Paper text:
DispLp showed very low activity against both substrates, while DispTs2 showed the highest activity of the tested dispersins. In contrast, less than 1.3% of the sugars hydrolysed by DispTs2 and DspB were monosaccharides, indicating a preference for acting in an endo manner. The catalytic glutamate residues, Glu161 in DispTs2 and Glu156 in DispLp, are 3.4 and 3.6 Å away from the anomeric carbon of 6-Ac-Cas, respectively, consistent with closer positioning to the glycosidic oxygen during catalysis. Arg13 of DispTs2 (and likewise Arg17 from DispLp) forms two hydrogen bonds to the C3 and C4 hydroxyls of 6-Ac-Cas with distances of approximately 2.8 Å. Glu300 of DispTs2 forms two hydrogen bonds to the C4 hydroxyl, at a distance of 2.7 Å, and to the C6 hydroxyl on the pyrrole ring, at a distance of 2.75 Å.
One key enzyme class is the poly-β-1,6-linked N-acetyl-d-glucosamine (PNAG)-degrading glycoside hydrolases, of which the canonical member is dispersin B (DspB) from CAZy family GH20. DispTs3, DispTs2 and DispLp all consist of a single domain with the expected (β/α)8 (TIM)-barrel fold for GH20 catalytic domains. The β-strands in the centre form a tunnel atop of which the active site is located in a groove, presumably to allow long chains of PNAG to bind.
Numbering used by the authors: 2 to 324
Write the structure that this text describes.
Amino acid sequence: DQEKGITIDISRKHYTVETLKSLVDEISYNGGNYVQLHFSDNENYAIASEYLGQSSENTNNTYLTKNELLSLIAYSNDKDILVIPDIDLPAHSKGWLELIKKKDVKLYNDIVTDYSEETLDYYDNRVALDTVNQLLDEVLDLFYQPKFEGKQRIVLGGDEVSGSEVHQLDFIDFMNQIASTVKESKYEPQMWNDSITSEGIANLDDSFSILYWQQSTLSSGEESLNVEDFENWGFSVYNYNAYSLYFLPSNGFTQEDINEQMDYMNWAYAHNKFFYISDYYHAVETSNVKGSSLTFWGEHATDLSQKKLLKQELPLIRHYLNL
Ligand SMILES: CC(=O)N[C@H]1CN2CC[C@H](O)[C@@H]2[C@@H](O)[C@@H]1O
């Protein structure tokens, strides 16, 4: 049984609760299993947070209200869709770090790396971990879904982490600590594949499942981890192929571009075709593949209305879910 899900970047682009419910409708209609809500990145923290100071119970341009988010989750569960929170750590963190800076600059200075305003200090910093863990505790409560008790998952990020290749055991220790936190709330942790190396794999909590979007290349020029490697160290993977299964909605696209994307998906997508350095659509014959996801990243969607976002995304959701 291979799962299929839709990942939605609501940090780079604003989505109303109605847009999101319409998208979930389409996921359910075509038998999709989950929706991954990527709500925390550099540009914005796009859900309500008592901890971070986003508490308005009024609809606004910056974050889903708590009531809106809970409504969305309940609507999803009623249609047998699991909602997977995605909070990106320790990089891709500028949006919530900027909120901490507002709340408490002393704390900000105690937890941000000295070189990157986008990156939480994962290099063995207890106050940084404690702060993260408080945020995670709020997120794990917010996304509680009793219908899926024992099956909940949370994406914890781990993509494009500066310093992670050199300082790999610190990165892995950090990821293991936040995995511990989510596992205490009976969530399965997940992370992207790209910043884990040969050096870290043996120390990484194999409770993690891996969102495998693009095989990395090490500073040596050597290939980084592939799906067989993950299998060999006890990790399950999901196919998030960066070419076949990424789409960036844009105001410059026409209907013809969406049709082309579907014709491209016809040949480029398969459940087990992963993005490897040698082959962008590499078929893997391992036993550790659990599913796939189409992801809508938000950074090109600047001038799109909500109606136009639906116009581009609905057909792509349907086409992917029926392939
Ligand atoms: C896991 C991942 O894809 N990470 C980044 C890189 N990808 C590549 C395609 C997008 O730019 C997207 C970007 O929005 C994401 O933040």
